[PDB]
Design a protein around this ligand. Sequence first.
Ligand SMILES: Nc1ccn([C@@H]2O[C@H](COP(=O)(O)OP(=O)(O)OP(=O)(O)O)[C@@H](O)[C@H]2O)c(=O)n1
Ligand SMILES: Nc1ccn([C@@H]2O[C@H](COP(=O)(O)OP(=O)(O)O)[C@@H](O)[C@H]2O)c(=O)n1
Ligand SMILES: [Mg+2]
Ligand SMILES: [Mg+2]
Lengths: 149, 149, 149
Amino acid sequence: HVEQTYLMIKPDGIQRQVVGEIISRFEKRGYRIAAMKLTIATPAILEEHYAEHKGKPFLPGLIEKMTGPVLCMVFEGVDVIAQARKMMGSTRPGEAAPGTIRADFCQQAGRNLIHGSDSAESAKREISLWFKPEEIQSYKLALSDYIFE
Amino acid sequence: HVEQTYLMIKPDGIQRQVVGEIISRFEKRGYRIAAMKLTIATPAILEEHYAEHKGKPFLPGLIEKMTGPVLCMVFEGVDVIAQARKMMGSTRPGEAAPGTIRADFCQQAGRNLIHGSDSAESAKREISLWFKPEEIQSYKLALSDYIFE
Amino acid sequence: HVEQTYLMIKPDGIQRQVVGEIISRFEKRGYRIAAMKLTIATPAILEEHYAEHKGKPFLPGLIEKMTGPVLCMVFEGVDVIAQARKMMGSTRPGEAAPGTIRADFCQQAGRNLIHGSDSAESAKREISLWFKPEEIQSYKLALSDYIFE
Ligand SMILES: Nc1ccn([C@@H]2O[C@H](COP(=O)(O)OP(=O)(O)OP(=O)(O)O)[C@@H](O)[C@H]2O)c(=O)n1
Ligand SMILES: Nc1ccn([C@@H]2O[C@H](COP(=O)(O)OP(=O)(O)O)[C@@H](O)[C@H]2O)c(=O)n1
Ligand SMILES: [Mg+2]
Ligand SMILES: [Mg+2]
């Protein structure tokens, strides 16, 4: 039984030119790319993405940091919502475990490279916000017999 | 004092073509390759390898998954039995620490890439099962003065 | 607010020819190279570097192991003194977390590849011991807007 999570490379990931390295970390576990699109995030869409934080003092600067090119992605795998969170590491890179993306690449929470859904409910909401259903692709990985038990 | 451990790349490591990457992780610590052999594991040898699991319900499916090409290896180093276990990570890749082999490459326990001896006694037994003494090679690493205190 | 830490690649890092790999790990987080110098450490400077172990029985052998080529470095970043220590891992490689330099490269404390300052006071002292002020270079990373919040 597999699930799907929303992962988004933030403008710092694009500008630091580590997009390929990020994708490779998820491919390495046999996670399937179900969707992928480069766009430029805008305030209206970011207000919806960060709807839980409406009105909080840090939101305007957060939206400013996130207004830029992003790579929208959907990855599929066993327990991938929780596992992708573990792979990204703590929101604050200084607290993230060695071997995680944020510990290996970043310094501060406001520039922490990547977003991933924090729950099944958020994954559904975020995939619906950033992708059209046309953009989610169904296919099977040829190495499935050696990835899944 | 160094010791020797038995490490075996399972059929998923062969088929996903990550043999070299696995070997590089152990070489990176200055662990010495003392033996190495590609073979195809068969039910009779796997029954002996997994003798501790005799009679258990999951053993038939385990033998099925393991029937395939494997790379038998012996690595030598300080505390290498316990250290190789640490580097492999938890049996369940989803529970394994970031930076370990199973966390970095895998999703499920039944396809977790690699076996390693879990004790001095099992290392002795496993090395003897898969290798004849004439297959174990003794030489000294040229960088020993910079690896060992 | 950034700080500076003293990091030194020990003779084993030079001789095992992993200098570039070590530097890349710190560059990967957006830490700035503020100083760098290859030298051959002398007992005189090492006795001051290790002044805290004066009178201990292991000090003569520690100085012996360190009398050799070293790469002196200063890196700058947010919380970089503590973060660089986390990236290095525990003094004993066997106790270090996977994904740290010592766990990924080393076996024993006496050959643990790299030194890093352990506190603000020790960083200030160590930078002054190994570098003249004219050797510390001030410049801004072009990617600063995408590294710092
Ligand atoms: N409930 C179980 C028990 C075992 N296994 C499989 O059987 C192997 C051996 O189980 P065990 O010896 O308990 O785990 P490890 O020591 O991690 O395995 P290995 O000896 O292969 O390193 C596991 O690695 C896993 O592939 C499984 O899929 N489900
Ligand atoms: N018990 C010890 C303590 C230190 N050492 C060595 O001496 C160095 C300095 O010791 P330390 O306690 O200040 O540890 P670090 O801060 O260097 O990690 C270590 O990095 C090791 O090379 C050792 O080999 N055994
Ligand atoms: Mg076992
Ligand atoms: Mg110290």
